Amino acid sequence: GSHMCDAFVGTWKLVSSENFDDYMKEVGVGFATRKVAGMAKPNMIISVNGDVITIKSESTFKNTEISFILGQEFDEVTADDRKVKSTITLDGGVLVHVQKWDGKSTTIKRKREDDKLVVECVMKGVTSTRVYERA
Numbered sequence: 001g002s003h004m005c006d007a008f009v010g011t012w013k014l015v016s017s018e019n020f021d022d023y024m025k026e027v028g029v030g031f032a033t034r035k036v037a038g039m040a041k042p043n044m045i046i047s048v049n050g051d052v053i054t055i056k057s058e059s060t061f062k063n064t065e066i067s068f069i070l071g072q073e074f075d076e077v078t079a080d081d082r083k084v085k086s087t088i089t090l091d092g093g094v095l096v097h098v099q100k101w102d103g104k105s106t107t108i109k110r111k112r113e114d115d116k117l118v119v120e121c122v123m124k125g126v127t128s129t130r131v132y133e134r135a
């Protein structure tokens with residue numbers, strides 16, 4: 001039946017982005033990828049089937065898809081082509097996603113706030129906020 005996770009399901013379109021270029025610099029994304037990725041207006045499509053959560057991002061730049069079980073590490077290829085080890089948990093209603101690669105780490109939080117899905121990405125001190133609304 002219902003899970004608190006249901007608040008995330010649906011198709012969400014990017015409506016605002018703040019500081020993503022600098023976040024991508026901190027991650028180590030090269031100039032060209034930053035420019036083209038920063039231009040994109042992805043949709044994020046979230047679905048749940050049993051214990052498996054799937055998050056797909058679709059854009060003109062790249063399409064990505066992760067499927068996972070909360071608390072169970074998985075290997076992820078990011079849109080910028082990093083091969084990372086990821087674990088996603090629910091903490092107080094927030095999806096918390098850590099990506100580790102090459103001795104580096106980044107944390108991505110996904111939260112439902114009003115009718116928005118708010119995604120906060122942090123690496124060292126650099127934060128980006130991306131807001132999505134229902135498509």
Ligand SMILES: c1ccc(-c2c3c(nc(O[C@H]4CCOC4)c2-c2nnn[nH]2)CCCCC3)cc1
Nearest residue numbers: 024029037040042057059061062079080108119
């Ligand atoms: C088109 C397709 C994908 C991206 C993209 C990227 C990154 N991370 C993203 O997402 C973060 C934030 C939410 O989850 C993880 C998104 C993304 N996917 N969906 N929206 N933005 C990693 C850094 C470099 C750029 C690649 C951007 C443009």
